[PDB]
Design a protein around this ligand. Structure first.
Ligand SMILES: [Mg+2]
Ligand SMILES: [Mg+2]
Ligand SMILES: [Mg+2]
Ligand SMILES: [Mg+2]
Ligand SMILES: [Mg+2]
Ligand SMILES: [Mg+2]
Ligand SMILES: [Mg+2]
Ligand SMILES: [Mg+2]
Ligand SMILES: [Mg+2]
Ligand SMILES: [Mg+2]
Ligand SMILES: [Mg+2]
Ligand SMILES: [Mg+2]
Ligand SMILES: [Mg+2]
Ligand SMILES: [Mg+2]
Ligand SMILES: [Mg+2]
Ligand SMILES: [Mg+2]
Ligand SMILES: [Mg+2]
Ligand SMILES: [Mg+2]
Ligand SMILES: [Mg+2]
Ligand SMILES: [Mg+2]
Ligand SMILES: [Mg+2]
Ligand SMILES: [Mg+2]
Ligand SMILES: [Mg+2]
Ligand SMILES: [Mg+2]
Ligand SMILES: [Mg+2]
Ligand SMILES: [Mg+2]
Lengths: 175, 213, 168, 159
RNA sequence: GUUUUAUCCGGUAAAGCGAAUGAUUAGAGGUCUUGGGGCCGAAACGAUCUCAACCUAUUCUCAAACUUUAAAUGGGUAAGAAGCCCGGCUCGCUGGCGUGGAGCCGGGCGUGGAAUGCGAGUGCCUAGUGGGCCACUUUUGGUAAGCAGAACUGGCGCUGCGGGAUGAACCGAACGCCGGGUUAAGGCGCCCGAUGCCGACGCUCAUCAGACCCCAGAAAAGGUGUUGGUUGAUAUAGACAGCAGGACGGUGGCCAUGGAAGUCGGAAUCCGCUAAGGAGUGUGUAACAACUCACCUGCCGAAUCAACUAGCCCUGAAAAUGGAU
RNA sequence: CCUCCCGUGGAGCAGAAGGGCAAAAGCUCGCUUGAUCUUGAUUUUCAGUACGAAUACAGACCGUGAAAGCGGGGCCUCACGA
RNA sequence: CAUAGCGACGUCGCUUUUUGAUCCUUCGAUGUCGGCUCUUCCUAUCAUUGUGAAGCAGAAUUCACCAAGCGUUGGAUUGUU
RNA sequence: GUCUACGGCCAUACCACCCUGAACGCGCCCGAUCUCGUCUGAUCUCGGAAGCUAAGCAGGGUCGGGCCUGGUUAGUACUUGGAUGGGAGACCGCCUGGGAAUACCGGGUGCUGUAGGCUU
């Protein structure tokens, strides 16, 4: 599974009605996938892991995107996940700050790739939850819980290094 | 005169047991598989800790003997000679072969090279899978750190990567430790020696009424 | 929940070339009239056709065309197989002479028969020469892997229309 | 270096199934084999006479000749890049009637019945069996219940 | 060289050994015997104690030449007009029977009885070849081999072109002579076409850094380098770290002895004082002694400690002409 | 040696192994010579050549059994020669 | 007194200065051992320079580090290496 | 509701032990002149009808063993096809489809064809 900017999909599926259970149970998951096709594939992967279902013997009755109900509010996301390292499987709890849930999950995927070299096919996101600021455990997140937060931008590197490519004045980094 | 164990590390051949076709096999290095207080009852040693392989490979009999000796020495030093029971969980049933060459300054001397290359039995190794248990130690619940250290010291006698694991089972049995006490209480388990006998609720009622009596 | 009817029309595009193909994949691609890279063909969906598409899965990209995709394909690259020749569908008489016995006499009848899979879908589909589409403008993601793992092969459900827009 | 023995490699092929040794049940001898009917060659090893070769075990052919104890079967054998219809004499212990032919004749009889009945009552009916069509649209009710939310389980080493 | 729908075929992978055939670990319970024997049994082992053999129920570990069970992939057949259903005739075959079977002769049935694709059938003459090799996967011998030998498909040979700097086989793609557009695999500091994006998030400093399939170099084991993560513990009834005290009595506890007095060794862990203290974690004194630890206390006033785990980096890491992301 | 009971074959079937087999294919008796005279077809190796081996028939002459039947060598897979 | 100096049972590597294994190049030929002579290169360092450690009191010796700048000889026997 | 004779499938039918069995029947049972076989009229063969359901046999039972069939094990082990996926390797993860077997826990314990009897 590749990535991009992930979206949250509420995927609902069930077994096909058979003359043993005419109304099989409906099951629901939150899938974070680049698009709905990958969302359906990952839904089948997970419900095959959990229940004894297959894409052939079941159907998906709903696959819709879950829009964030407060994209204008900063909130703390705690993520429980498991992944396979080069020499085993580990359960992890990670914390992120973002406006959207899927944005925090994308942050998590990038961070796992950056720190643990974990490719996205190795990572299983098993719970995403908004947490209050007093329940945060990571100091990298807790240091933003200040109502009087204040910091400068110390060493602003020039990014327009080629417009102009040649000039007389040497750039300033203090602003 | 033994070859380095790197030459027979991987499970490259089919299993080659000592059978009526494979004759002339030298006896395995390891002959004893249980040490400590083997006669200890089930309730005496509740904690059980396994040492689990992480690679599909071959463990030689000499390696098992060395690891067993090391773990025995550390357990005797720490918990006393009667405070533990160890069980080596691998048996060297696979025979490795050697196509012996003359180690002199001559190839004309009937060396024949690779002609008739099928070798003769060198020794025996144990084939271990990923997730398979190599050694198990059961002891008092207060010697967990000593079991972990003894199994850690035995890991250095083996080629690949191994993990130490404290099982949820009671001792060497297959029943979970939390369920063990209340299963013995209602007589679903009957201790006998180092193991327990599961008593299913079916069969003649005579074997039921010899219990509860 | 309303579960829509499963799609009964698929547009299959062959995305890999003709070098080093296993015999079964090669035979199935011949049966799909996909003998060249970036060739397109409408496939009526059922158990047999779906299993055939499963056989050649790494070599094809397929999905469910909408009405606009069918219209663009038939109108821009629609060529008829008339007397075993590849004739451009420039006149309605070309359709009428070869398919009038089935009631298909114009471009619109052909497009309706292809879109809503009718009684005579086999004849109308075999009449169409397989669509010789260009290279996808903007490039592909990865032709060697599946769509659900970042590539281009396999069944993209309704994203085949984006590929069609970039393709012809 | 392989031998060319007639029964090489048939250690399990011609062996009897578990707890199915002993006397051959007599209804195998009571079957009626006409010319032209379809039989499956199996080859039980209890009866050593009239045995088929190992290359015909599991093959299916058409009976063309009937004798006292055996039948003549025309069976296709593939040799290099050609298929040739071999003719073999196999005792009836090693064959049985093919059920595919029985099902097909049943279908033909039922189709002729449908044709006659439909012509009598005028309404057209479908006879050509179709491949499994795509599932049509349908409504899946909840009956006032929330579908269960499933989450992948955390990892732990078991055994 | 395809699927689908029916219908058979199989014994590989797996699995099993509290199921057969072989291999094999350990205890448990019983009671016969040319088991040893067993202390007081000779006297009827008056007795009944151990270990054997044996049996029973369990228990650990296995099989290319074992197996109850048993896949995936796979092999065969069928999916009609040469069919179906009616009547009749022939037979020296068969025979209770106007029986069975086979053949033959008339007649009626087309919704042409799955999907997809394709035009097929047939004959003659015939060159070259009969040294092969390589790659994924399966697989035999061998420590291994750019070794030797098999299965399947593809390729090189017979093949040029884009990429892998370079390369018979790798990746893309197969080729008439050209123009425009677009791509594949692969790339976009400069060589050298293209990131001269105000690209996004992190990780990492190497006095041998690292840098892309095949592929052209590394392992076990370590790190108080840094970054995540798991589990557990301590703490305003004041943690942690520093600095300062007590660290006893019986008892220089018993058996060791030549001193071993807590510390050359064997067993057990007493009590009371309480602030605590092991009849001891180590240094050691010939021995004492003098030290230190674990344990508490004083000052110190907010968080702290431990064991693992895995990312990059470092150690492990040595060869010859000067040199190779 | 005799007797009873349990006994799925854990024995035997000439031999190597595998398959097969219990009022069997094994053991003991009785009678025999189908291990005989013939023509073709077929399978196995296969080039669908031969040898060898084998399967199913058909025509004689017989054996056995009350009979149904079985038998043209050995329960099957080797034991051979232009 | 495990680790000053060693290291059993095991187990992980490196080298191509041994001998094998293989047979890819060379059979219309690549002159096949040793010695002599001469140059350069490697370090897995014998000595020398600077060091760390010891069961380093001194002397002698042992282990290790940076390190190949410089040196590593004269003869009896043997075709010898 | 059953039995006898001949069977088909060949344990849901077998195995161990216990209980019951009305009427036919099947048997046990009596005997050795004849037929026929024996070391032995035990078996076999023949001729019977005093007694008995004790046995065979039939039916039922056993927290029975076995067998049959489910569930669990488990979408686990294994596996078709794919990638310039990871890893020094050994091997592992993912995509695409298929998918087992113990232990453990339930349920069941012959069905039936032809001919001929019995059962108020
Ligand atoms: Mg060596
Ligand atoms: Mg091998
Ligand atoms: Mg290619
Ligand atoms: Mg462009
Ligand atoms: Mg490829
Ligand atoms: Mg296996
Ligand atoms: Mg066994
Ligand atoms: Mg050759
Ligand atoms: Mg080779
Ligand atoms: Mg050539
Ligand atoms: Mg070619
Ligand atoms: Mg080429
Ligand atoms: Mg090139
Ligand atoms: Mg390169
Ligand atoms: Mg061009
Ligand atoms: Mg470049
Ligand atoms: Mg440029
Ligand atoms: Mg390094
Ligand atoms: Mg005859
Ligand atoms: Mg015979
Ligand atoms: Mg060669
Ligand atoms: Mg020359
Ligand atoms: Mg020269
Ligand atoms: Mg050095
Ligand atoms: Mg039972
Ligand atoms: Mg799979």
């Amino acid at each position: 599974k590749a990535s991009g900017t992930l979206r949250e999909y509420k995927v609902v599926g069930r077994c096909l009605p058979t003359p043993k259970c005419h109304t099989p149970p409906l099951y629901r998951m939150r899938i974070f996938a680049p698009n709905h096709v990958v969302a359906k594939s990952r839904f089948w992967y997970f419900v095959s892991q959990l229940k004894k279902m297959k894409k052939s013997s079941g159907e998906i009755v709903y696959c819709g995107q879950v829009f964030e109900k407060s994209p204008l509010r900063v909130k703390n996301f705690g993520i429980w996940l498991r992944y396979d390292s080069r020499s085993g499987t580990h359960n992890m709890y990670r914390e992120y700050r973002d406006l959207t849930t899927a944005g925090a999950v994308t942050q998590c995927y990038r961070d796992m790739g950056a720190r643990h070299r974990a490719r996205a096919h190795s990572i299983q996101i098993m719970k995403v939850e908004e947490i209050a600021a007093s329940k945060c455990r990571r100091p990298a997140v807790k240091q933003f819980h200040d109502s009087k937060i204040k910091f400068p931008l110390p060493h602003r590197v020039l990014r327009r290094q080629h417009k102009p490519r040649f000039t007389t004045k040497r750039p300033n980094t203090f602003f | 005169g033994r070859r380095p164990a790197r030459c027979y590390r991987y499970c490259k051949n089919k299993p080659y047991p000592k059978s009526r076709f494979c004759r002339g096999v030298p006896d395995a290095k390891i002959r004893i598989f249980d040490l400590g207080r083997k006669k200890a009852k089930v309730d005496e040693f509740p904690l059980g800790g396994h040492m689990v392989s992480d690679e599909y490979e071959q463990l030689s009999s000499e390696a098992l003997e060395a690891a067993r000796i090391c773990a025995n020495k550390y357990m005797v030093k720490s918990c006393g000679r009667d405070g533990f029971h160890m069980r080596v969980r691998l048996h060297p049933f696979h025979v490795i072969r050697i196509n012996k060459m003359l180690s002199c300054a001559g190839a004309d001397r009937l060396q024949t090279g690779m002609r008739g290359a099928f070798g003769k039995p060198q020794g025996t190794v144990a084939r271990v899978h990923i997730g398979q248990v190599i050694m198990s130690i059961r002891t008092k619940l207060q010697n967990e750190e000593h079991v972990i250290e003894a199994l850690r010291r035995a890991k250095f006698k083996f080629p690949g990567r191994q993990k130490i694991h404290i099982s949820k089972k009671w001792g060497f049995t297959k029943f979970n430790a939390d369920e063990f006490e209340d299963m013995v209480a209602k007589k679903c388990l009957i201790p006998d020696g180092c193991g327990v006998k599961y008593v299913p609720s079916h069969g003649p009622l005579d074997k039921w009424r010899v219990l509860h009596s | 929940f309303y579960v829509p009817a499963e799609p009964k029309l698929a547009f299959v595009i062959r995305i890999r070339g003709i070098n080093g193909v296993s015999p079964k994949v090669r035979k199935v691609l011949q049966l799909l009239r996909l003998r060249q890279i970036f060739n397109g063909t409408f496939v009526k969906l059922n158990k047999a056709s779906i299993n055939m598409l499963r056989i050649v899965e790494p070599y094809i990209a397929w999905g469910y065309p909408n009405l606009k995709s069918v219209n663009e394909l038939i109108y821009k690259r629609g060529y008829g197989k008339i007397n075993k020749k590849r004739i451009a569908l420039t006149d309605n008489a070309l359709i009428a002479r070869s398919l009038g016995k089935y009631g298909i006499i114009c471009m619109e009848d052909l497009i309706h028969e292809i879109y809503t899979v009718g009684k005579r879908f086999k004849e109308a589909n075999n009449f169409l020469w397989p669509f010789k589409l260009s290279s996808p403008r903007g490039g592909m993601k990865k032709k060697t892997t599946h769509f659900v793992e970042g590539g281009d092969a396999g069944n993209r459900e309704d994203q085949i229309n984006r590929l069609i827009r970039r393709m012809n | 270096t392989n031998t060319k023995g007639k029964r090489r490699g048939t250690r399990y092929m011609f062996s009897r199934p578990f707890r199915k040794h002993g006397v051959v049940p007599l209804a195998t001898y009571m079957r009626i084999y006409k010319k032209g009917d379809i039989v499956d060659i199996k080859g039980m090893g209890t009866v050593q006479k009239g045995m088929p070769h190992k290359c015909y075990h599991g093959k299916t052919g058409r009976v063309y000749n009937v004798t006292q104890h055996a039948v003549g079967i025309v069976v296709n054998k593939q040799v290099k890049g050609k298929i040739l219809a071999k003719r073999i004499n196999v005792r009836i212990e090693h064959i049985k009637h093919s059920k595919s032919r029985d099902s097909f004749l049943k279908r033909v009889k039922e189709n002729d019945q449908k044709k006659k009945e439909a012509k009598e009552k005028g309404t057209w009916v479908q006879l050509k069996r179709q491949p499994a069509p795509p599932r049509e649209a349908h409504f899946v009710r909840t009956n006032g219940k929330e579908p269960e939310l499933l989450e992948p389980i955390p990892y732990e080493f078991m055994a």
